[PDB]
Every structure is written in structure tokens, then in C-alpha cells.
Amino acid sequence: MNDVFTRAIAQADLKGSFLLESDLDKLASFAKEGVKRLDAVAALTNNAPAIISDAAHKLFAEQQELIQPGGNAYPHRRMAACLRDMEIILRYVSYALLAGDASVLDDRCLNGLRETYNALGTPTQSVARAVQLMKDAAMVHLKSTANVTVGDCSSLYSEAATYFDKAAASIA
Amino acid sequence: MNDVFTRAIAQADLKGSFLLESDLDKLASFAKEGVKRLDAVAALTNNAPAIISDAAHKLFAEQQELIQPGGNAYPHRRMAACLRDMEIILRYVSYALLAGDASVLDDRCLNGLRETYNALGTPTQSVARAVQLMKDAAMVHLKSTANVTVGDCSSLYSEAATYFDKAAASIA
Amino acid sequence: MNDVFTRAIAQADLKGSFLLESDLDKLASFAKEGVKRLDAVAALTNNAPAIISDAAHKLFAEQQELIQPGGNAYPHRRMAACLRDMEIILRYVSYALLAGDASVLDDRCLNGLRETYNALGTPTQSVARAVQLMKDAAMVHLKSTANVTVGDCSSLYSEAATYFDKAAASIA
Amino acid sequence: MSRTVITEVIATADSQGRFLNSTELQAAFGRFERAVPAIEAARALTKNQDALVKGAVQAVFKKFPYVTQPGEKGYGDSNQAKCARDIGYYLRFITYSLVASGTGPLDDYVIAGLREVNRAFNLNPLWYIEALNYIKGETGKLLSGQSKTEALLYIDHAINALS
Amino acid sequence: SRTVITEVIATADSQGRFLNSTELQAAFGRFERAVPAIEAARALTKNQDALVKGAVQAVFKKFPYVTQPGEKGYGDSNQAKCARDIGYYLRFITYSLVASGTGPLDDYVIAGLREVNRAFNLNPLWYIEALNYIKGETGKLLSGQSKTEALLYIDHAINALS
Amino acid sequence: SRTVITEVIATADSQGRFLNSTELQAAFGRFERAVPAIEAARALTKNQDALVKGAVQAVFKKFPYVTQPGEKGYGDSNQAKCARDIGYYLRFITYSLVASGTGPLDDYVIAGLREVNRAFNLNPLWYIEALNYIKGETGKLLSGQSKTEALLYIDHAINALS
Amino acid sequence: MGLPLLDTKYSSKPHRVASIPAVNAEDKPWVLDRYDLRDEQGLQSFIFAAY
Ligand SMILES: CCC1=C(C)/C(=C/C2=NC(=C\c3[nH]c(/C=C4\NC(=O)[C@H](C)[C@H]4CC)c(C)c3CCC(=O)O)/C(CCC(=O)O)=C2C)NC1=O
Ligand SMILES: CCC1=C(C)/C(=C/C2=NC(=C\c3[nH]c(/C=C4\NC(=O)[C@H](C)[C@H]4CC)c(C)c3CCC(=O)O)/C(CCC(=O)O)=C2C)NC1=O
Ligand SMILES: CCC1=C(C)/C(=C/C2=NC(=C\c3[nH]c(/C=C4\NC(=O)[C@H](C)[C@H]4CC)c(C)c3CCC(=O)O)/C(CCC(=O)O)=C2C)NC1=O
Ligand SMILES: CCC1=C(C)/C(=C/C2=NC(=C\c3[nH]c(/C=C4\NC(=O)[C@H](C)[C@H]4CC)c(C)c3CCC(=O)O)/C(CCC(=O)O)=C2C)NC1=O
Ligand SMILES: CCC1=C(C)/C(=C/C2=NC(=C\c3[nH]c(/C=C4\NC(=O)[C@H](C)[C@H]4CC)c(C)c3CCC(=O)O)/C(CCC(=O)O)=C2C)NC1=O
Ligand SMILES: CCC1=C(C)/C(=C/C2=NC(=C\c3[nH]c(/C=C4\NC(=O)[C@H](C)[C@H]4CC)c(C)c3CCC(=O)O)/C(CCC(=O)O)=C2C)NC1=O
Ligand SMILES: CCC1=C(C)/C(=C/C2=NC(=C\c3[nH]c(/C=C4\NC(=O)[C@H](C)[C@H]4CC)c(C)c3CCC(=O)O)/C(CCC(=O)O)=C2C)NC1=O
Ligand SMILES: CCC1=C(C)/C(=C/C2=NC(=C\c3[nH]c(/C=C4\NC(=O)[C@H](C)[C@H]4CC)c(C)c3CCC(=O)O)/C(CCC(=O)O)=C2C)NC1=O
Ligand SMILES: CCC1=C(C)/C(=C/C2=NC(=C\c3[nH]c(/C=C4\NC(=O)[C@H](C)[C@H]4CC)c(C)c3CCC(=O)O)/C(CCC(=O)O)=C2C)NC1=O
Questions:
Q1: Second label for F92, Cα 20 to 30 Å away, from A78, F77, F86, G17?
Q2: Which residues of chain F are within 8 Å of residue C29 when distances are taken between CB atoms?
Q3: What is the CA(E131)–ligand 1 centre distance, in A?
Q4: B53-57 long-range contacts, Cβ below 8 Å, gap at least 24?
């Protein structure tokens, strides 16, 4: 787990040099927009059940083959596992968004997940499609302006899209 | 973990036979020279910090790139780990010197150390150099004629050198 | 004039760079071997009249036409010049052996010696033959172990041979 | 793997297997406010690093005359260079900790493994204690206000762990 | 196996410490005892066949029934296996003497003794009788400290069987 | 160039005779002096950039006016040439250390030094200041015979400038 | 103690995510506890399971 400050520091230390003026400017800019970052994190956190349910509905609407017998999301045992995995991935994306780096998403979640999915027989491109649906469903709540000071957050939207896409690519 | 006695016993058992008279003579000679062996192992044990400090001073005078930022022994944690590894190897060499057989050293210390260092990004050639420096520092103390009865300890010196050499070769 | 060090410095200057660590290592090895080099040069110097006399005897037994009236070493004067030239060439070979470089031999001794001998009517094949006989006598003396400490000096032998046969190649 | 505010938040959330509750976001926002004086102190400290390092070496010598005479650790030009290098290391990691708004850089780079290394090389902690106290005295002058306190916290933490 | 030196090294290694003075005094105690123990081992090796056959006949005398047909001791194969087993016990006792530790016995004979004897319906009493015979003949064959050491290891084997 | 071996060989060459004990002893002394000399050259090479930067800064410290506009130190190209010249001097000092003679300096720097300085209006005291800084620093980077070798060459260059 | 350990650097494993009951109950390992220690045969079974 490294946030942006910690990696800036690690990269400075490998070079064995102090942090430059421009780098400190960038870190101060990050800290300044941290309020927007926190609003994005809260938008993901509060709306998580809605995002998971919406993505699941869409995924089983397109790929019904999962929910028929013989599909890989058939019994309540496997459907609940699907929903659990989606919640895990969304949670780790929220962690990465708050931290500012995909380090946590790299190490704690996606370390060996494709191999596990292959052993279980799960379709990995289906899991990736589910994560993409989660991303599309979560951008809606991210862009919601209710009870929030209105402003620009396009960088945060791109960052969250990058984290979701990185999880999806790692799994697929 | 076998000493010379247990090694002889195991070979005799594999042959299915009692120990021959020549093997008993060799073990009797080993037991007779065990007093000098105990002196040598005591010399190694009672000078361990001095041996490690001397080896470290030589090694990091010779190889300055380690103690630089981006070197493998840069922060205090890695420097402490370097000294700790040197103490571990010296401890196992003293065990082997007492036992008279390097089975303990190979089994418990050197068996998988090269791949551990490779996994950690450690220059194994530098570790072998450190072990050789420890060998020199330990031979300075083993040959200390003062405070002990004078006698022929060439065989013990050669055994200690062989254990240090075998450690260095197995690491790098 | 050039020795090995000065050539190395010359290429380094042509690149405009310092001397690399490998070049410094080669020069350190040269200077370490310098005492053997001194022994080789002193063997050439001390036994020079013997070398010249042996080469002359062998050459004029092989080629009797040189010492008949009408030969190119017939009158006393031409014979003195012949022996003088052999001494001069051996002396520049000893110079090149000490310097580690064949530069002085080329610049001084073999600068235009083939055209000199061609204009004089001097058989350049016979001059090269004399250089080969001198090389043989020199190797006989340089391999001598009496009054030196025994050691491996094959690089010096091969280098001395290269100086000799480079002289003989330039002449013929 | 540094132990900062955001990292502590995420680690304690993951250990409990839950999303980030509001309290964790509260702590993160406190850190984000706090970063501004911390970056200011880091800037005003990295800018004047050379004066600090020289003054720290001289202050250690003044407090410890005996290290300088022959047969001691301080005698030697190379030992002078290693003086400056060590104090520069400490200052650099103090600035890192200011930037990171935690002790993570100090704990990870200086504090962990301190005592074994000092014992192995027979370096006296009191030398660095004096140097850091000098740096504290100076950063009293260089900085003012919230940034001054923020720098003093990390200098004090380094001194406490050197003890 | 397990000796004095190996106990020392294992105890030092389990606490991750260098060999201190107590361990070296134990080692010196071993090295000084080695001479009588190796003498006892040499004497016991010299007396292979006499001791083995005497032990087998002692077992046969104390358990006359076992030699009857339909029992364990009947038949040349079973008597050969008896001789082989007593030879094993004697060999491992000499190994223990040389090692100056009950490691050879504990690792080769004792560990798994009850399970194997119960599976093959072997009686520990046969081996106890044979070892008591070996113990008796040891007093004749050894004098001084060597006899004491050999009796110690044979006693350990007997206690293990019973 | 002009180094101990070369002087030996040139003297023998001009006198029309072989290399004798006096000349071989000179060569000997050169071959043993090579060790601290090569060590000094390696140390100076490893620290060339630090030495050059420090030398430029010492030059600007001792001659503040040169950086002012309208003078030889004003501008980036002039300071690039600063560092280039100091690197030249350092390179040729390392060359002379390796060659064990002042021949590299004399042939590459000193021969034509005064005329070139006079033509481009360069001040010899600038380079004396830089070489004094390098002398002070090699006092720290080096020790023993390595340091005296380096100082002899740096002082030859300084005396050439003055 | 001494130095701190390195990072754990986790990996995806079933135990890390076990909110849901396992597939087969009979394949769930027996969770032996203190109340097994009170009986005699239960204590013997617990000891065997520990070994
Ligand atoms: C903390 C980080 C972490 C993650 C993310 C993780 C994922 C994970 N999901 C698993 C099972 C599963 N995961 C799924 C979900 C997939 N299958 C369906 O097709 C869906 C489309 C899709 C979800 C998007 C299913 C159905 C199973 C059960 C497979 C089975 O029971 O055979 C398992 C195997 C353990 C078990 O049997 O329950 C792991 C390790 N593990 C971790 O330690
Ligand atoms: C309790 C935990 C907590 C939260 C949730 C938090 C968010 C937060 N965002 C704020 C302003 C803001 N928040 C946003 C974020 C918006 N930009 C776009 O419109 C999006 C709809 C949205 C995010 C994607 C922006 C742009 C500002 C104004 C700051 C600026 O850019 O000037 C403020 C200051 C305004 C006020 O308090 O009245 C807070 C406290 N801080 C906290 O300590
Ligand atoms: C009983 C046999 C045994 C040994 C000896 C052993 C050594 C060992 N060395 C380690 C790391 C290390 N080892 C070294 C030592 C090297 N670096 C320096 O350059 C020197 C050249 C050299 C020492 C002379 C260092 C610096 C580390 C730290 C790497 C890190 O912290 O990332 C680690 C794992 C990381 C840790 O927790 O510290 C082990 C387990 N393991 C074993 O099972
Ligand atoms: C409690 C641990 C312990 C120690 C410390 C110990 C030391 C010890 N060393 C002894 C002799 C000796 N000690 C040495 C060893 C020395 N020879 C060379 O000088 C070497 C520098 C050096 C060893 C590397 C030798 C060769 C003997 C003579 C052995 C003999 O007489 O057979 C003796 C017997 C006294 C004698 O023979 O007069 C003892 C008890 N014994 C122990 O049980
Ligand atoms: C221009 C006129 C001229 C002269 C005068 C001359 C002298 C002369 N005689 C020679 C051979 C020789 N000549 C002699 C002389 C005789 N041997 C003994 O029976 C006598 C004691 C002694 C004379 C009294 C000897 C000893 C050699 C041996 C040289 C050798 O072995 O290479 C050689 C060497 C060439 C060869 O191998 O044949 C020369 C240069 N050469 C000339 O071109
Ligand atoms: C005044 C002129 C002068 C001379 C002549 C000189 C020679 C010289 N030869 C030496 C040894 C040596 N000399 C030789 C060379 C010989 N060994 C083999 O037999 C070869 C046939 C032959 C080489 C042509 C060797 C191999 C050594 C041993 C030192 C080494 O190998 O590095 C030494 C080192 C000390 C010694 O071991 O005696 C010197 C100084 N030094 C001088 O200042
Ligand atoms: C991560 C940060 C870090 C620190 C702090 C650090 C301390 C440190 N300082 C060292 C050298 C040294 N440092 C000193 C410092 C003393 N000199 C005296 O004049 C002063 C009183 C005092 C400084 C003001 C000395 C004397 C040595 C040489 C010790 C020796 O070689 O025995 C060394 C041994 C490495 C070597 O020189 O090869 C370490 C590990 N290392 C690190 O990686
Ligand atoms: C580690 C050393 C070791 C021992 C000690 C040992 C004992 C031993 N003896 C065996 C056989 C046997 N051993 C005996 C010995 C009997 N014969 C006479 O009756 C006597 C009364 C008595 C001996 C005192 C007999 C009868 C068998 C045959 C058991 C059977 O096949 O049912 C067997 C079964 C393997 C086989 O079929 O050969 C073992 C394991 N095995 C070992 O590996
Ligand atoms: C092989 C050895 C060698 C040396 C040493 C050397 C010196 C040298 N430096 C030059 C440039 C220069 N060098 C300097 C001097 C530096 N700038 C000032 O600020 C400092 C005080 C000072 C640092 C000590 C300056 C000002 C120039 C530009 C001069 C001009 O073009 O008018 C020039 C003019 C030619 C050019 O444009 O490059 C020479 C000949 N040239 C060589 O080939």
C-alpha cells in the first residue's frame, strides 16, 4: 500500500535526493484536490449496493448463460460468491481512489486472481465485463451533484476509470 | 544434522555392518583432538561481534556501492540485515566446526540461500566476499596462541577454512 | 615515442574520455609484470654480443655467397656494416620490449629500412633471415632460468617474438 | 509500505473487511488540510539543507571535543564526510516525513535497524542527538507558525527514537 | 541421529544463540568418555557371533514353547530372523556407545517398536531375555568403565522394550 | 610522450647503446610507483564530476566579478566552457598519473598554454584557483602515496599556469 | 525481537473471502474445541486430532 506521497518519496530516495520544488508543487496540488477525492470516495462507498446490483442485473441480462443450470453463477452459493467478488473489487477500487495509486489494488486483490478463476472454472472475460459494468454504473453516482459543491472533477473520473479498467484487465 | 560420529554410524548401518576397527580409530582420534576443537569453537563464539565488525568494515570499504542510496545495504534496516546474516552464517560455521561435519551448515543455513538472495535482489558475490572476510577475521582469532596451551591446530584451521569456503561457494 | 601507457592515453584522448576501469586494470597488470619485463630486457642486453655472433655465424654458414668476392658482406667494410645493423636492430627490439610498444622500432629502425636495403643492393630476404637467427638466439637466452627466480613469462616470450618478426616483416 | 494516515485508514478498513466509513474519510481530510504547512516546512527545510548540515556537524564537534583527537572516530577527513552524509540523511528523511505527513519515512529508513547498526559500528547516538537538537534550534528560526510545530514534531520523534 | 554434540547444537539453534560455556563443558565430558565407550564398542564388535548365538539360545531356553512347530520360533527362517534381530540390537547398542548417545537406538530400534511388535505379534519379552543375556555376558567381556557404558545402553534398550 | 620509460629509451637511443642498469633501475622505480599512481587516477576518475563542479564554484567564489554581465563568466556557454576546461585539466592529470610522467600535461595543456590564454583573454589565476580546489579535495579523496602523486601532478599544472 | 519483518504481499485465497458457507458441510473440517476436553473419549479424539 503506497499512496502518491509515499511513491514520490520512494522514487526520491532511490535517487537519494530531496523532493524538488516542482514535485512538492504537484503533491500540494494533490492535497488541495483531496476534498474532491474524498467526495468521489464517498460517492462510491455510499452507493455501493446500488452499483453492485445494477452491474449484476446488466451482466445477467446480457449473459444469461451464467444463471441457467450448468452456468457458473447458478446456485445461491455461486451467485452470492459473484456478488461478494464484485463488492471486493469495488471496495479495493475505493481504496485505490482514496490513496491515489493502484498499489493496494495490485497487491491485496489482483495478485493471483486469474489463476483462481481458471481453477474454479469461472469465465474471466465475464468477470471483466462485470467490472466494466460496475465502472459504468459507478460513474453515474460519481457524476451526481446532489448535496455536493459543484465543480470540475474530470481528473477523478479518469482516475476511477483507470482503476476499474486496471482491475478488469488484470482479471481478464 | 550429523556429527562425524553419526555420519560414520549411518554409513556403517547402510552397509549393514558394525563399525570397522579403522573407523573406530578415526573416531577415537577425533575424540582425542576434541579439546583443541572446543578451543577453536570457543574462539569463534567469543569473538563473533569483532569478526562481524571487521568483515563489515572491510566489505563496505571495498564495495562502496552497497552503502549508497539505491544500494542493497542502504537504509538502516538493510544494513542491520546484512550484519544479521553475517552473524547467522558465523553461528552455523561454529556449529559445524564443533560437530566436525558440514551437514548442519548445508542443511540449516546454505541449502536455499542463493535463491533467497536472488529473490531479494541481493548481490550474492558480495555475500560470498563478506563470508571470506569473516573467514580472515576468524582465522586471526583462531590462531591466537595466547591464553591457550600451545599445540598443532593446523587441521582445525583447515576445517574452519573449508567450512567458510563451502559457505561462500554455496551462496555464490 | 610511445609505450603501452601512452598509447592507451592516446586513444582515450581521441575519444576525449577518461581511462576506463578495464584500461587501468590492464596498465596495472603491465606494471606488475614490469619486473619480468626488466629481466627479459636485461637478458637481451647482457647477452647481445653472443646473440649477434651466433646469428652471424649461422647466417654466413647458410649463405656463403654473402662472404665471397661480389657478395654483399664480402669486404671488411660491408661485414662491419652488416654486424652493425644486426646490433642496431637487436637494440631497438630491446627498446620495444622495455616499452611494451613497437612504436620506437617502427619510427626509428624500420622507418625506411626496406628502401634503404633495396637501394644498397642488400638482400632483404637475408636481412630478415638474420633477424630470425637473432630471434632464435634471443629466445635461447630469455628462457634461461639461471640467475632469475623461476616463473611464467610466456607473454614476454611471445611479445619479444612479435617484435623480432615485425622487424623481419618490415624488412622483407 | 509506509505507515501514513491514508495507509492506516485503508489497512484498518481492509482488516475489518469493510468500506471506508465516515470517520476514516474525516481523518483523511484532516491529513489533506495538514499537508499544506507540512509541504511549506519541507520546502523551507530542503532549501536551507546545506547550512543546516554544516551547522549540525560543527555543533556536534563543539559538544563532543573528544571525538576529534587522533585515535577517535571523528578524526579523519572521510569521517568528516560521513558526518555530513549521515546528518544529510536524517534531514532528508525528516523532509520526507513532513511531505508524507507521518513518521513512515523515519521509521522505515532510519529508526528501524538503528541500534544494531550503531552498536556494530560503535557510533554514539549522542552525536546525532546533538546534531538534531541543533537542527531543531535552527528550524525554530527558519520556520514560524504551524509549519514550525510540524517540523519540530518529526525532529523530536527522531531524537526520541535515537535515545 | 542424536548424540551429546547434536543435542548441544539443536538446543543452541532452537534459541538462535552461539554455543556458550555449558554446551562446551558437555562436549568435553563427551570427548573424555569416548575412549572407554569406543573400547566397549570394539570389544562388543569382536564378540559378534558368540554373543548373538548365546542370546538366541537364552531366548530359546527361557521360552521353550516358541521352538515348537506351529509357533513363532519354529523353522529355520524364523530362527534366522531371530539371529538377525539380536544382531540388529547389538549393532545399534555399539552404535550408541560410539555416538555416546542413545540416538542410534532411539531412532532405529525404539521409534516404532510397539507398533511393529504388535503388528507382527512379536513379544518384547523375547528381546528382553536376549538383552539380559547380553548384559550378563558384557560383565565378563568388559571391565571398568567400558562395562558401565555398555550396561547403560543395554539397560536403556531393556527399559524401552518393557 | 615524455615519461620515465621514454626518457630511458631516448637516452639510450641517442647514445647509440643498450639499456643498462641505471636505466633499468629508473624503469623499476616507475613500475613500483605505478600502484599509488593508478589508484589516484581511478579515484580521481570516479569523482570527476564532483571535482569539476566544485572547481567551477570555487572559481566563481574567488572571482565574483566574472559572473557579472559583460565579463567572461556571464552566460551559460561561458560556464559550460568553464566546466569543459576543468574537465580537460583533470583528464590530463589522470593521464599523467597513469603514464608516470608529466608528458601528457606538457604535450596537451602546457605547450601553447600562454599564447592561447593571451589570445582569448583567459586569466591563468582562474585555473590556478580551480586546481587549488582540486588539490584540496584530493587531499580528502586520497591518502598516502596516492595523494602525493596526485599533488605532484596538480602542482606541476599549477606551476605551468603561473 | 529485532528488525521488523518484510511485507506480507498477499494473494487471493479462499480463506481470505469466506463470508459464504463452504460448498459441502461434510467437507468442512471439524472445529474441535474446549467442550470436547471434558469427556474422556472426546479428549482422546481431540488428542488424536491434534497429533
Ligand atoms: C480479497 C481479494 C480476493 C478476491 C477478489 C477473491 C476472489 C475469489 N472468488 C472465488 C469464488 C467465486 N467467484 C465467483 C464470481 C464469478 N463467477 C461468476 O461468473 C461471476 C460473473 C463472477 C463474479 C463477477 C464465483 C461464482 C465463485 C465460486 C466458484 C465455485 O464455487 O466453484 C474464490 C475462491 C474461494 C471460494 O470458493 O469461495 C476467490 C479466491 N479472493 C480474494 O482473496
Ligand atoms: C465527511 C467526509 C468529508 C467529505 C465527504 C468531504 C468533501 C468536501 N468537499 C468540499 C468542497 C468540494 N467538493 C467538490 C467535489 C465535486 N466536484 C464535482 O462537482 C463532483 C459532483 C463532486 C466530486 C466528484 C468540489 C469541486 C468542491 C469545491 C472545491 C473547489 O474545487 O474549489 C468540502 C467543503 C465544502 C463544505 O464543507 O461545505 C467538503 C467538506 N470532506 C470531508 O471531510
Ligand atoms: C539460516 C539461513 C538463512 C539466512 C542466512 C537467511 C538470510 C536472509 N536475509 C534476508 C534479507 C537481506 N539480506 C541482506 C544481506 C546482504 N545485503 C548486503 O549487501 C550484504 C552483501 C549481504 C550480507 C553480507 C540484506 C541487506 C537483506 C535485506 C533485504 C531487504 O530488506 O529488502 C532475509 C529475508 C528478509 C528479512 O526478513 O530480513 C533472509 C531470510 N535466511 C535463512 O533461512
Ligand atoms: C569449557 C570449554 C573448554 C576449553 C576452553 C578447553 C581448553 C583446553 N585446552 C587444552 C589443551 C590444548 N589447547 C589447544 C588449542 C590451541 N592450540 C593452538 O595454540 C591454537 C591457537 C589453539 C586452538 C585453535 C591445544 C593444541 C591443546 C593441547 C591438546 C593436547 O594436549 O592433546 C586443555 C587440556 C589441558 C592440557 O592438555 O594441558 C583444555 C581443557 N577445554 C574445554 O572443555
Ligand atoms: C676483405 C678481405 C677479408 C678478410 C681479410 C676477411 C677475414 C675473415 N675471416 C673470416 C673467417 C675466419 N678466418 C679465420 C682465420 C684463420 N683461421 C685459423 O686457421 C688462423 C689462426 C687464422 C688466420 C691466421 C678464422 C679463425 C675465422 C673464423 C670466423 C668464424 O668462425 O665465423 C671471416 C668471417 C667470415 C666467414 O665465416 O668466413 C672474416 C671476415 N674477410 C674478408 O672479406
Ligand atoms: C637493475 C635491473 C633490474 C632487474 C634485472 C630486475 C629484475 C627482478 N626480477 C625479479 C623477480 C622475477 N623475475 C622473473 C623473470 C624470470 N623468471 C623466469 O625465469 C623468466 C625466464 C624470466 C623472465 C624473462 C620472475 C618470474 C620473477 C618473480 C616475480 C614475479 O613473477 O612477479 C624481481 C623482484 C624480486 C625477486 O624476486 O628477486 C626483480 C626486481 N629489477 C631491476 O631493477
Ligand atoms: C539511512 C540513513 C543511514 C545512516 C544514518 C547511516 C549511518 C552510518 N554511518 C556510517 C559511517 C560513519 N559515520 C560516522 C559519524 C560520526 N563521525 C564523527 O565525526 C561524528 C561525531 C559523527 C557524525 C556527526 C563515523 C565515525 C563513521 C565511520 C564508522 C566506522 O567506519 O567504523 C555507517 C557505516 C557505513 C560505511 O561507512 O561503510 C553507517 C551505516 N547509514 C545510513 O544508511
Ligand atoms: C531397526 C531394527 C529392526 C528390528 C529389531 C526388527 C525386528 C523384526 N523382525 C521381524 C520378523 C521376525 N522376527 C522374529 C524373531 C523371533 N524369532 C524367534 O522366534 C525369537 C523368539 C524371536 C527373536 C528373539 C520372527 C519369528 C519373525 C517373523 C514374524 C512373522 O513373519 O510373522 C520383522 C518383520 C519384517 C520381516 O518379515 O522380516 C521385524 C520388523 N526389524 C528391524 O528393521
Ligand atoms: C586541451 C586543453 C584545452 C584547454 C584547457 C582549453 C581552454 C579554452 N577554453 C576556451 C573557452 C573559455 N574558457 C573560459 C574560462 C572559464 N569561463 C570563465 O567563466 C571561468 C572563470 C573560467 C573557468 C576557470 C571562457 C570565459 C571561455 C570563452 C572564451 C571566449 O570564447 O572568448 C577556449 C577558447 C576556444 C573555445 O571556444 O572553446 C580555450 C582554448 N582548450 C583546450 O583545448
A1: F77
A2: none
A3: 63
A4: B53/D120, B53/D121, B53/D122, B54/B133, B54/B137, B55/B86, B55/B130, B55/B133, B55/B134, B55/B136, B55/B137, B56/B82, B56/B83, B56/B86, B56/B130, B56/D120, B56/D121
